[PDB]
Amino acid sequence: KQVSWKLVTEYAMETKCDDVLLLLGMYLEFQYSFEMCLKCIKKEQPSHYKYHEKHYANAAIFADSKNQKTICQQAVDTVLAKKRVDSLQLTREQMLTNRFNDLLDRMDIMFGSTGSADIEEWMAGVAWLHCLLPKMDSVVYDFLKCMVYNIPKKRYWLFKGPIDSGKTTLAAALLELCGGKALNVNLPLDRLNFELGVAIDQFLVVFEDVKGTGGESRDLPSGQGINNLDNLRDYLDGSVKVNLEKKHLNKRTQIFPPGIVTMNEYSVPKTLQARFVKQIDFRPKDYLKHCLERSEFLLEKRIIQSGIALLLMLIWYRPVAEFAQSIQSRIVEWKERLDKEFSLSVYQKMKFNVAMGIGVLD
Amino acid sequence: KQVSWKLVTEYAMETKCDDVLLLLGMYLEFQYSFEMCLKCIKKEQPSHYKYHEKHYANAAIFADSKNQKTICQQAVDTVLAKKRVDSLQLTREQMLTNRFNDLLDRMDIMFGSTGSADIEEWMAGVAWLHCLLPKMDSVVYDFLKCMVYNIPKKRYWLFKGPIDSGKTTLAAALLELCGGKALNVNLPLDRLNFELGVAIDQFLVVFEDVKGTGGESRDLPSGQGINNLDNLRDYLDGSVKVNLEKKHLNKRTQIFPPGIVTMNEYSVPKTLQARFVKQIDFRPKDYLKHCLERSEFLLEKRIIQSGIALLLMLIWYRPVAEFAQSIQSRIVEWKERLDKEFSLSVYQKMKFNVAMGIGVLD
Amino acid sequence: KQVSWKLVTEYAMETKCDDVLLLLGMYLEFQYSFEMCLKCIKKEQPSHYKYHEKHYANAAIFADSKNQKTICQQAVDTVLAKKRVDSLQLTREQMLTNRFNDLLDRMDIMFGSTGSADIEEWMAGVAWLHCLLPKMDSVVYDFLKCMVYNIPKKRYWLFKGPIDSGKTTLAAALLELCGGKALNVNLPLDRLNFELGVAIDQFLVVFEDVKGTGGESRDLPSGQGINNLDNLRDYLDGSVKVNLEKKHLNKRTQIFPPGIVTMNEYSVPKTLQARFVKQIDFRPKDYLKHCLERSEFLLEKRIIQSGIALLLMLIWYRPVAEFAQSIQSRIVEWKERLDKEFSLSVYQKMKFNVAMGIGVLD
Amino acid sequence: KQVSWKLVTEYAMETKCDDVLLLLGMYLEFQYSFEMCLKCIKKEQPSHYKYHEKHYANAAIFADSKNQKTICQQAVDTVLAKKRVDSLQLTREQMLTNRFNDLLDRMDIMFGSTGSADIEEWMAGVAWLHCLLPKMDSVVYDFLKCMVYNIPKKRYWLFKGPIDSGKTTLAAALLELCGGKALNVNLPLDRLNFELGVAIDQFLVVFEDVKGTGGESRDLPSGQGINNLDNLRDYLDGSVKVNLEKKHLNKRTQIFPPGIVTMNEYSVPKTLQARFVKQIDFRPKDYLKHCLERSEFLLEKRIIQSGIALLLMLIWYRPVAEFAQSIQSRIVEWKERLDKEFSLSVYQKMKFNVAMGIGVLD
Amino acid sequence: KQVSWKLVTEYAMETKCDDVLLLLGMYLEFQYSFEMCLKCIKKEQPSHYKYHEKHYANAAIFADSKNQKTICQQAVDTVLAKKRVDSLQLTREQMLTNRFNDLLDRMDIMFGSTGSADIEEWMAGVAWLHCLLPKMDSVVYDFLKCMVYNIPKKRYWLFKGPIDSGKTTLAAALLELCGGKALNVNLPLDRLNFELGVAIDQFLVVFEDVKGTGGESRDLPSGQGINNLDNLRDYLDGSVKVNLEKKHLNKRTQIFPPGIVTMNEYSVPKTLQARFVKQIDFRPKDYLKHCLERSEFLLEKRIIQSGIALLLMLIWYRPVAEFAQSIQSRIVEWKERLDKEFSLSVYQKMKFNVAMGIGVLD
DNA sequence: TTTTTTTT
Numbered sequence A, B, C, D, E: 001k002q003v004s005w006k007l008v009t010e011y012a013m014e015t016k017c018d019d020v021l022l023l024l025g026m027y028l029e030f031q032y033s034f035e036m037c038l039k040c041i042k043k044e045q046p047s048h049y050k051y052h053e054k055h056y057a058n059a060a061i062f063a064d065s066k067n068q069k070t071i072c073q074q075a076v077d078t079v080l081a082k083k084r085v086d087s088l089q090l091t092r093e094q095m096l097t098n099r100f101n102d103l104l105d106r107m108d109i110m111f112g113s114t115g116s117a118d119i120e121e122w123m124a125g126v127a128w129l130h131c132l133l134p135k136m137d138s139v140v141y142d143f144l145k146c147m148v149y150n151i152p153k154k155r156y157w158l159f160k161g162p163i164d165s166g167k168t169t170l171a172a173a174l175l176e177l178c179g180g181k182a183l184n185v186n187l188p189l190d191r192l193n194f195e196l197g198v199a200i201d202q203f204l205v206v207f208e209d210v211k212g213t214g215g216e217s218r219d220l221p222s223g224q225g226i227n228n229l230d231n232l233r234d235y236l237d238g239s240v241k242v243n244l245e246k247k248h249l250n251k252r253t254q255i256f257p258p259g260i261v262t263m264n265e266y267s268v269p270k271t272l273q274a275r276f277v278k279q280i281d282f283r284p285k286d287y288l289k290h291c292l293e294r295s296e297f298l299l300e301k302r303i304i305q306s307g308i309a310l311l312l313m314l315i316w317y318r319p320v321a322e323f324a325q326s327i328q329s330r331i332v333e334w335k336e337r338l339d340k341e342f343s344l345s346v347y348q349k350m351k352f353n354v355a356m357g358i359g360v361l362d
Numbered sequence F: 001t002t003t004t005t006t007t008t
């Protein structure tokens, strides 16, 4: 009897898998009886245990096929095709709404009964991030709106301050929240071509550590990044399309995505200042350092790195109307859960502890 | 029963799709019942909702096919083949009229009932453009004729001005009007061959912001572009065919298309000055800036960059006789629609606002 | 019922088509009923309307086929095979005799009933070229003999003169006449591998304004041209076969075609001077410039740079016996037609106008 | 019925055709009735007219096939396989006597009833060649034996002489005689590696006018030649096997063939100079120039380049016993034909005219 | 009836053929009746005549196959797979055992019934070899077993002594017995990086004459080699795996093979000295130079640098027990031959002639 | 697999 290529393609769509080998390997695991399957019983991986019982019959026949990689290629093509349709048709608001739904699904697992995470430790994360800058939650909301509208010239934000000011932490969490890539412009001009190629079809980009020149007056090591950026005015202003390249691929043409620039305290040309909507200053604060010393489960579990943490911050702080209408129903349910799990007193006690530089938990 | 490859080829032809993935992903959407298709019901994408009901039955059988990518490959070849045939057989005038017919079709949507655009905002853009240079509409007509005639050694226009003088803004609109590609020649000579490969079958090209050398006298940064360009005289001259290269592809041979060069105020070898038929200065002007500050919906919606804006300018200013015969019927209808919606006093009020540096509207 | 691959192959032979996409595109057009084919009715393209009615029946079945690119590939291979057989077995004189028949067929169309070309404008071009150098028609006959005889190390003609001397204009018309390729050697020395690979099976080649050195004294900025050419002395000399490369293709070994090099007046090593059997000096002459200004239809229709114009010159000036026997019949008919449609006094009126620098016509 | 791939492969073997396009084109000619075949009637090409009648029936069925290139690919591989088997199993003497049989077969045609060449002209070529250097036949006999005995570090001879001093003229004739390949050194080693791949299964090679250094004192521009030569000492010695490259096909390990190198008077490292038995070149004899200038059919028909002229020279000069045994029958047969058609006085008359530098065929 | 793919695969295994073209060509030869087969009658090649009669029936059907190259590709894979299994599985001792068997077969070739390598010229080579320096057969046996054991640190010998001293000559012969390569180090570090990759997968290696920096105090001209090697601590010791690299290719990781260093009388750091098991110095000798001058047949049939000339030297001197335990059979059989063929007096006469520096084959 | 990338 025949293999159903359709059931494979459906699994690939549902897992959103787009590596042929990863797709292949996982489907083969279903060939053993789901009824006895230790991976099912131990509830180890949702992309397995949700699916094993459904695909078992087809996996058994798949295991005898002689066409195995051919089946997988067509399946993976279907997933890649769906992505490109979406890229050309969705609004940036819908893109972000989809991205949020993905994170919310991961949170449902993380804090589920199977969930290994501790919602209390993750709320301790939110308390620390809310102390990193004044009006942190309002600042995030502004950044997101700026990315969604993608208004030309009004596109780019500058993070400034010394080593261990925290700027890379916040960049990483934002980059996880929205999706995107880091880029390093400190290179010589020739390699920048493939470097910028990374930006193709991304939502955000982040420029790391754009080294100035002459900051060595204050021990900052000098480099070319600032000059290179000043030579990229149209990529930043985003008013017109640019060509982009990848290794072994022909060029594509698109609006270069919005993003973030990060630096230590180099001097900035006025030509470059004009490019930026907003500059945010990061300054070392000892009470955060002493708090982290006593609350290091934050670092160990990478809580303060994660977009998941920022999403919890938005859920706790923002009015429901601020979210895209479709997901507002899920947001209410999470707000309800958090209101059940914590009183404001509990949360504010944590904020006080952080201000003391004491460990977050008491 | 079996897949009709013919119906897929029709869909590719009618959508003018030439990406195999986009074609695939699009066609797969039709497999669900159009009668419930929310994309149809919400009238979100014409390249969907026009076609779903027609293609539905074949899409269901296509969803079961084991050959899916081969079927799409043949369809995409047919669309590519038609472009090839046209490149060798249309007059340059006919090409331009086809291109115009497509923009006019897009304008029909944008200002339709489903049309989101405000014709008053788009007409405001024409006022700002007609201020950017003396006799602006005459300049556009002269450029269009030059591009149609494609007279050898009389093929290229040079734009000069300081930064923020509007040259790349104007180049963008012409390029969207005619269709074509931008190119960057401030490069090492080795990559340059794959760079020039982009010009294949294009109508225009634009060489963007070519760097001279010694312009640091004027504080200009310096680079290869001008010296690199003087090695390419025959590409400008267009008197003879040249050979063009793409990655993993053997060379094509054709005449290199006509176009535009933009730069800040470097000096130039007259071996290259001889190649330019015309040179246009651009100058910063305060009232444009002050007007634009109070008119930022122009920038937010990219109106000022977009070829639709130049087409609207021509329809307003130029006689019907100057358009090629077949489109004169549509041109007449659009002229009637514009005149119905705008008095000369309204248009002159807008122009007077721009001159005064108030926001365009009042 | 099934596709005749034989009928397709025959059309590719008939058209001498050798791009698979161009072949595919044009054969598809025959699917619609020739009974109403607007292209046929408008008599626009010979390669269509001559063939549509014959191929229509087979094109309808081709339109359904699943193999389409494969059928086209075999047809293109048959045309390519015919070219290789010919290149290995014809005398160079027969090759040229065939080329002349193809041009004469095009002239029969151009000045035929459809008659898109005015023979008066075309003859005005002949007067302009015959004025460009002394004894012009004698010089063309010398060049043809040289290319036919292909005497080793007596194989190349050098054109020198300042900008707008007309050297490219003459080279362009000659290249069209014989059929051949232009090539750029002002290039990085590695990429020459695939560049020169284009010369496979060609009859004649041209190198462009080849960037030398020493001319910096006169603002000729220098480059790899003369450097590279003084390497390839064997390619010029043609005493031995050389290996030529294409992408995804193993090398072809053959003797390298004769031809022409063009030069603004850089310096040349005498190892290279030894290899040009002849050099011609070209000079700007204002009265030609004044003539062109008033006679711009020459440039706009590209008349003066077409081998069609050179063929008309030879028909006017040379004895019938100088042509190969099989075409002497066609030559006689065109001599008669020319004598009918022009008196000598008209041609003398034209040539006088050219000398005066006024508009050629009066 | 169906195509006999066997009959196709026989033709490929008997033509020794080893290009798939050439073979394809050739065989398709046979599809017409040979009984009226104009080429047969003309006796135009032996590789056609000998075979048309035999292959006609199979060619008709071949003309309808859908596998045509695949059939030709298998046939071509049979021919290459035969070459590869000979390339290892035969002695260098056995190879050479095969080569001579092929040339003798051409001469039988060239002076045959078609007789398109006249042995008197070719004899005048012999006279010019034997006049070019003393005892030319004897120095050739030395070179032949050296190449058969193939002694390492003694596998190569050089010419270092001036331009237009004939070294290429002689190399061409020897290379035609031996059936080697020319190769080009003057390249980046990072691609020369592939070019050397052509040396697979060759009797002999020649390296061309290789760019040294220090020749700059006499305007010879320096380059990669000297560098790449003194690098490849293994190949120059003939020390060991090398894995020679091919595209889309495996590389092959085999020992490199012996050869010749030409240059003008560049530097040569003594580390290189060690590797050559003879390092000898020859310099202009102006009277010969005046002879050529009055005997130009010699050059026009390329007689003095062609290995056929050398073979005629050895037939005249050498003892029958100096040839390999089996061909000595044919050697005697041709010695008869020379002595039948020429007196010594005629040959001497040619040779004094040559030495006098005058036109020869008085 | 049908081609047995099995029989084709047997022949490939038995011949150890691993080029698809050779396999194809040779197997096709069997298609003629073996009963008359003149290659069999002449006993030209065992790879033919040993097999033809067995394979004949299958070869006939093979010649009619339409699939031929596909059969051969699978057969060649079988032989390559066999090598890769053994290459991974077996010991250095087993591998040398087989390398002996190969070279003992080349003795069975060279001194088989054709004797085209004269066993006694090869004895004169053995004489010149053993006369070269002290105790040479033992010095070989020692160095050989040293390289078989590959014991850490105990892995490198230093061949000092001047130009033409023979050190290069001998290493080449041992490399014939085992494979391997020589290596440069005389360069700045960026060169060394890629150069070190040459050692990858070598069963043995050597270093080219180290022009040691700091040898110029001895007036020995130099490059960086001494400081290079003195820094390369591990590579010599072979204590642990190291990484190796090539142009355009990824890194590989392996224990760096053992070997030899060659130099003239250069300066050495005592650290670098500690890396070597033996210090040796070679010198040119007046008897030996005048002997080869008088005995050049040893150069002509490639003897003195041949590994077989070492193999014969070992079969002469070394007892059967010193050879691989089963190959010892062949050792006895060649001992029988050589001891029968040559008296010790002719061997001693030959050695004495070398001791007189006079021609060996008196 | 070639190519492009890499290497320069």
Ligand SMILES: Nc1ncnc2c1ncn2[C@@H]1O[C@H](COP(=O)(O)OP(=O)(O)OP(=O)(O)O)[C@@H](O)[C@H]1O
Pocket: A132, A161, A162, A163, A164, A165, A166, A167, A168, A169, A170, A209, A263, A264, A282, A283, A284, A285, A286, A288, A289, A292
């Ligand atoms: N505001 C802060 N005050 C004190 N310590 C901080 C602060 N922010 C971050 N840290 C400490 O700095 C460490 C590194 O943080 P992060 O990488 O975000 O800093 P950064 O300023 O972006 O650094 P860099 O510029 O070097 O990448 C954190 O793990 C934390 O220990």
Ligand SMILES: Nc1ncnc2c1ncn2[C@@H]1O[C@H](COP(=O)(O)OP(=O)(O)OP(=O)(O)O)[C@@H](O)[C@H]1O
Pocket: A233, B161, B162, B163, B164, B165, B166, B167, B168, B169, B170, B209, B262, B263, B264, B282, B283, B284, B285, B286, B288, B289, B292
């Ligand atoms: N003539 C002008 N006078 C004043 N402001 C101008 C003028 N032209 C453009 N602007 C302002 O400058 C911005 C940038 O315009 P644009 O990018 O076309 O300038 P440019 O000088 O042509 O740039 P570049 O040469 O770098 O491509 C516009 O969006 C507008 O805000």
Ligand SMILES: Nc1ncnc2c1ncn2[C@@H]1O[C@H](COP(=O)(O)OP(=O)(O)OP(=O)(O)O)[C@@H](O)[C@H]1O
Pocket: B153, B233, B239, C161, C162, C163, C164, C165, C166, C167, C168, C169, C170, C209, C262, C264, C282, C283, C284, C285, C286, C288, C289, C292
């Ligand atoms: N002899 C001439 N006298 C005056 N004008 C000329 C002459 N020859 C050409 N022209 C003008 O010069 C233009 C360019 O001619 P052409 O390209 O053949 O010259 P060129 O010397 O080969 O130039 P370049 O070095 O730029 O390639 C022609 O289109 C014509 O307008």
Ligand SMILES: Nc1ncnc2c1ncn2[C@@H]1O[C@H](COP(=O)(O)OP(=O)(O)OP(=O)(O)O)[C@@H](O)[C@H]1O
Pocket: C153, C233, C237, C239, D161, D162, D163, D164, D165, D166, D167, D168, D169, D170, D209, D262, D263, D264, D282, D283, D284, D285, D286, D287, D288, D289, D292
């Ligand atoms: N000895 C000679 N006497 C007179 N003319 C000669 C002589 N040798 C060569 N020539 C002339 O030189 C022409 C070119 O010869 P050839 O190409 O063989 O020389 P070459 O030394 O190899 O030159 P190059 O290195 O420049 O290619 C010959 O066709 C002939 O006209």
Ligand SMILES: Nc1ncnc2c1ncn2[C@@H]1O[C@H](COP(=O)(O)OP(=O)(O)OP(=O)(O)O)[C@@H](O)[C@H]1O
Pocket: E161, E162, E163, E164, E165, E166, E167, E168, E169, E170, E209, E263, E264, E282, E283, E284, E285, E286, E288, E289, E292
């Ligand atoms: N000891 C010797 N006495 C005389 N001739 C020798 C001796 N050794 C080698 N030869 C001859 O000299 C040639 C070169 O020897 P070889 O290259 O092995 O010496 P080398 O000492 O390694 O030289 P170099 O240090 O110059 O690279 C050999 O091929 C052989 O013909």
